[PDB]
Design a protein around this ligand. Sequence first.
Ligand SMILES: [Mg+2]
Ligand SMILES: [Zn+2]
Ligand SMILES: [Zn+2]
Lengths: 1335, 99, 73
Amino acid sequence: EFDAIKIALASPDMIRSWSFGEVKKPETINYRTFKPERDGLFCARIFGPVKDYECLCGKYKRLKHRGVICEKCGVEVTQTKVRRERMGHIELASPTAHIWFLKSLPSRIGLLLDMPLRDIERVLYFESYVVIEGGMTNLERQQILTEEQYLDALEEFGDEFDAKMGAEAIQALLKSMDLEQECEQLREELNETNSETKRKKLTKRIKLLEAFVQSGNKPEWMILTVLPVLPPDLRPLVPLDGGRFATSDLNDLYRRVINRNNRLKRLLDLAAPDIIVRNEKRMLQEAVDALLDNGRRGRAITGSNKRPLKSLADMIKGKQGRFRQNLLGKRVDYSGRSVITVGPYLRLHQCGLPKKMALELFKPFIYGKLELRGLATTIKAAKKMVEREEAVVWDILDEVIREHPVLLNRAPTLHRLGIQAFEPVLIEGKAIQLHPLVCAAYNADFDGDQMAVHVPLTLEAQLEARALMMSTNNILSPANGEPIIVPSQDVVLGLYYMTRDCVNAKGEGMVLTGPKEAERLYRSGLASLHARVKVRITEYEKDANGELVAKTSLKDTTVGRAILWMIVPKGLPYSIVNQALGKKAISKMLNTCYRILGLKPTVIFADQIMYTGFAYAARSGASVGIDDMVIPEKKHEIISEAEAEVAEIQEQFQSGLVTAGERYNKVIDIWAAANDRVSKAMMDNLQTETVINRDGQEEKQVSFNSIYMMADSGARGSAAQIRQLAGMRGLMAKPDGSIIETPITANFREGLNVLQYFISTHGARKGLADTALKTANSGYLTRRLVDVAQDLVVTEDDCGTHEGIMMTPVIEGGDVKEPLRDRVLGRVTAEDVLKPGTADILVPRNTLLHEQWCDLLEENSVDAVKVRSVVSCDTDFGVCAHCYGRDLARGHIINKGEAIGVIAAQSIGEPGTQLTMRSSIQVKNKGSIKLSNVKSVVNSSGKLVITSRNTELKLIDEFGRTKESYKVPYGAVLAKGDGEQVAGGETVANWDPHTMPVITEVSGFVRFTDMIDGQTITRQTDELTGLSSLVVLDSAERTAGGKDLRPALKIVDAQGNDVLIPGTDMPAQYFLPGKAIVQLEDGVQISSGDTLARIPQGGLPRVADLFEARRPKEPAILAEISGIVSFGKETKGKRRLVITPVDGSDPYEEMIPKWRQLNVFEGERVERGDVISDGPEAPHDILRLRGVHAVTRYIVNEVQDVYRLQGVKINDKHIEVIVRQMLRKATIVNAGSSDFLEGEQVEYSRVKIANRELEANGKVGATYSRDLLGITKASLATESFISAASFQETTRVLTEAAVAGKRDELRGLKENVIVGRLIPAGTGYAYHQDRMRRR
Amino acid sequence: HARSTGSYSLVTQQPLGGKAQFGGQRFGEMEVWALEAYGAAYTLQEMLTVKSDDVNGRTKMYKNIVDGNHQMEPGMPESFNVLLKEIRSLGINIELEDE
Amino acid sequence: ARVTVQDAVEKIGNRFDLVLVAARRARQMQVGGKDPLVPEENDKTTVIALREIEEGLINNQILDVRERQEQQE
RNA sequence: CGGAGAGGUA
DNA sequence: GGGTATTCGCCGTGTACCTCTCCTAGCCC
DNA sequence: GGGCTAATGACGGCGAATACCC
Ligand SMILES: [Mg+2]
Ligand SMILES: [Zn+2]
Ligand SMILES: [Zn+2]
């Protein structure tokens, strides 16, 4: 129908064009009759008629008189819908300052007038004055005054000078200002003046001004003159059940405003003295303030008791304003909800549903089939028929259901498996039966959860539901390729019981030709369920080009496992079933079934798993009794010896040997050791409980005790919970978080005392409150992430770029945590993979990679894979297809359109419930030695020390890859070197971290070069030996004279001349910091690498701080420019550091709060982006120094470390596209041959499509700089403003879009959701292809 | 508790909430995000326009379902117009534009 | 009687042209005329349209030729 | 048919 | 002057139900 | 009884507004 939404400022002519009458009188209704009162808020002759097509006096109740107004009462007879459409207005005697431009911070009239806000509030609230056109006076133009100063201005200049007060004077200020002269003056002062705050405020002022001249607005429109009023139906008069009216407070506000304005007109009729009308106009300004935004000015007005009331800003802001209450979430007809129940006989492509709800929902369909069969032609008798529920209507209902899907929906919708589709099957009763496996997708137990049904009406929606949102179409998850149809608890227990090997029972040691007679034996009872038996199976391998080959043999197996074999489809091998079949096992069974046999065998295989699992879990009888938990008899002795040991440590404290904290730590360690002893004891005594005969004497096997199976299957709980049910439940924390010194010795199979139960009550309530507030911050995180990656839709098929990030598996300095395969898997390469058979084109450079190709990659042992990424995608207004690779939860590549930002935000913020909130290296594996950023020399001992700070140790294995990586400090003691081989566990990496090294490059004499004794240094004598050391102190405790007398240690030869360092001509001068302990004295020659001085010394909000990209509490700063380093002026607050390039220009300095333990010396040459003081790594400096790819690598490795530490895996693509939408904006360096301003901030895609064609012609492009905004910030500064009106505030956004006149072209999801057309994401993206192809 | 077509609300032409007042469910905000996450679009378009807000579209929908057709007629959500009359009830000029 | 729409996506890999093609054909088969070219199982035109997709004889091209020829007639 | 306030359900 | 150096407000706050009451009360006729 | 009848138990971030040395 239409296009972009234009916004601007209200003009008084536009206001008078909008309205259809002045409300001159503040009445509301008659309240004696129900008729409205003339010319009040509920006015007929302004707004329209109460009832449809009936005049107020009752003249023309006929449709024939449509259009003609009355003359007895003057009512335009039309519908009553026009009382929803016509606005109104109030003529105002006083011009009025609009409140948002007053107090937006930044105030638009505030910085527009180049005037502080305090004087503006003093002018508006009638307690000051201001100058309008002083001229030839002693008074400046912007100058504000007071009353005695007003008497002065009456004395000296009661003539030609003039001045006013209040908002009328602000209107005169806005009328009395040229804009082009202000533009010229501010541009000149930008070219001339050289102060940073002046540059900032003037560039904001000139941005506002030249944007405002670009806008079609006048500044005095920011001062209200005529107040537009809402239609009456939007502020309606509702009576309660009684003789009153409890309405909205808008009507009370307008009542106050009209009374105030009419009494002000009457007090401009009687010509009052001016102090009273100052107070009266102040009350009117207050009234308009309270009408627009109550509470934004100080102490707010109220309604009922003292409670602050609702205004327009409350109608648009906040949670319960219209965007989050009535636009993005709307109540919807054809809906229902009930308590869920199971009905296990169902297949997963269907759900149960009550008959009465189905008869409630599908009423128009039943009406349609009723008058199609013609059992009742009309509709009212038909409605009585469906009210009666006669004999024919149920067959009609079974007609209209049979192939019509519905949507099922648990209310806390975290991720996109919160809503699915099902084909209903009518069930008696009153509760929704629901297929059980799918419950694990909803995270919905049967404790009383209320799932809601919706019904699609139209034919396209039925095809969307059956074709996209069906349960069959979703068996993998958009988190990652773990199938979400993992079975939950009962059926996995039944399977784990069904495939296990007892050593002897009936049928042990015979042979069987087929699994059919195995089932025939088990249903007979003439055998065990499970016994190691050689049978014949037959498997079907499709090793050829999609062609079945049947092979067979005898396999040793168990009998129930053979029974399970009659369920698996053809292509799976036998070895998938020959194990115990835990939860991980059956999950990867379904995964391999999906990877080999497509879809339909996997779905029917899941159905048959569920049926047979429930059947043989019923045949099992896996109960639990009190004798099913076995207390180890060692526990009495273990607690006794632990009590003896803590008595020993306590009596060693009362003798005075140790401290209290040492006692605390040693006692808590011996308690933890005894706890692990109890753990080992109970785990042994469970898992080898079965010691039985074998048809011979004796044999142990894995135990058929119940709770060991319910823990070993992985059904519910793990070693922690079964540890608490048998052994002691360790230690619990106090509310301060200090771990409690006297642990919980008892266990739940025995009794508990009062006290340990009380301690665990502290722990449990702490856990519950943390889950509550954790779900709170998780919800707010999900909301921010869906409104920061709102706009992003895959729109193209290739962008044809070579760039991409690098992929290596993750190592912190322990095991290789997540291997190269899973990060590479499903993503499309950037450049070709080069095996170390160098120049072997192993894969083509721009191809998709699935799991067979990943096995080809892994067995060829590839160490680093260059791959395309979403942040490096080069797509205009979107993301290309091949940078996104496999759409996870499906097999193939992403289709053209299917938007990823929403599934990214959901798959990040979903496991937030499952999260938590609040020396020397012994190298492990065996391989050759590699170093990165290496610079080394051999010491006097023969060992190898490293003369570079940023050196990493890599351990090449026997394969060639990197399996171990370690952070080595500057100057470690290696027993081996590079180009060599170390053994498994041979100690090489060792250093002393407590002392920073002064290890020397060269050898020679150490004189006392620039070492002043008594003024710069001090002489401290070690009391333990007597061989002392010189001690250089800091900059403030000594005098200021020796502050510029630097400590130095310079190497000279046997002739005393300066030893020349190879590489330069500079000697070896070594500078020292304050608070050091200088080692040597005169007359000693040092070795290369010799110490010359003894130098002294995270949860969900971590995630939230990363996506905000905050500076931490102590930001680790880095080097801004390459070159040699040098110090500067001492302690003008900080210590300044100046890097001078070897060939470039020096003048950047960086202040350092020098209380930090710094890293760099004074004579070092470093790369840009190199560390100065250590600490947490700030993201913005990494972007503006290192690059885009390094900073996205940092964020993805940190947040993958968090989500992987909690063990719930998220694929990298979602995090990467969030990172892309973080840095969507940019900042301009130079204008170039384009027309952008220098300090203009503008988004990256806009300036990219700008300068892309400006290089395509003869002109030159421009330079930019991407700045890395937070998630909540880059949502705001967008092409749209309606998204930011939906997100987190309204006042700032709508003032900015008001002064911009920003023509809001839709371009995105939620904007197109508000206007209610199709979403340009999927089927709507094809629709918008068509409509954009029109224009 | 369920609903086919009941009372609509007064300040916004939207379905009511509750069982006592004979209303329907709330298709919440994250559910709109869930539908956006799937490639489905027509479901959402008839959801928050035809089945919920626009009076002309839903009355013609009622006639079309009793007359055998399955076809939506989008038009415009009424709540969007209510939002626009409130923002225009501020000192803000906001309008609609070209064909 | 239809559980999966996998083969329909095997014949049209885009999965959104699936929805538009099936919806256009099923609208033209719902209200009047242009009889389904498959035997039916007392099931609605949704399942009929997807079933005729999985017989391969419905895509965007057949609808283009037939609508163009009905325009020519 | 509106909004508060209190309790409970996940 | 002017660059940090504080302080001064602004603003956000998990989704979806269900049950119940109480709604402008003031006040000199 | 009624007919008009017009305070105090958050908290983190964050950016704009001054203060105060230098
Ligand atoms: Mg639950
Ligand atoms: Zn009349
Ligand atoms: Zn790309």
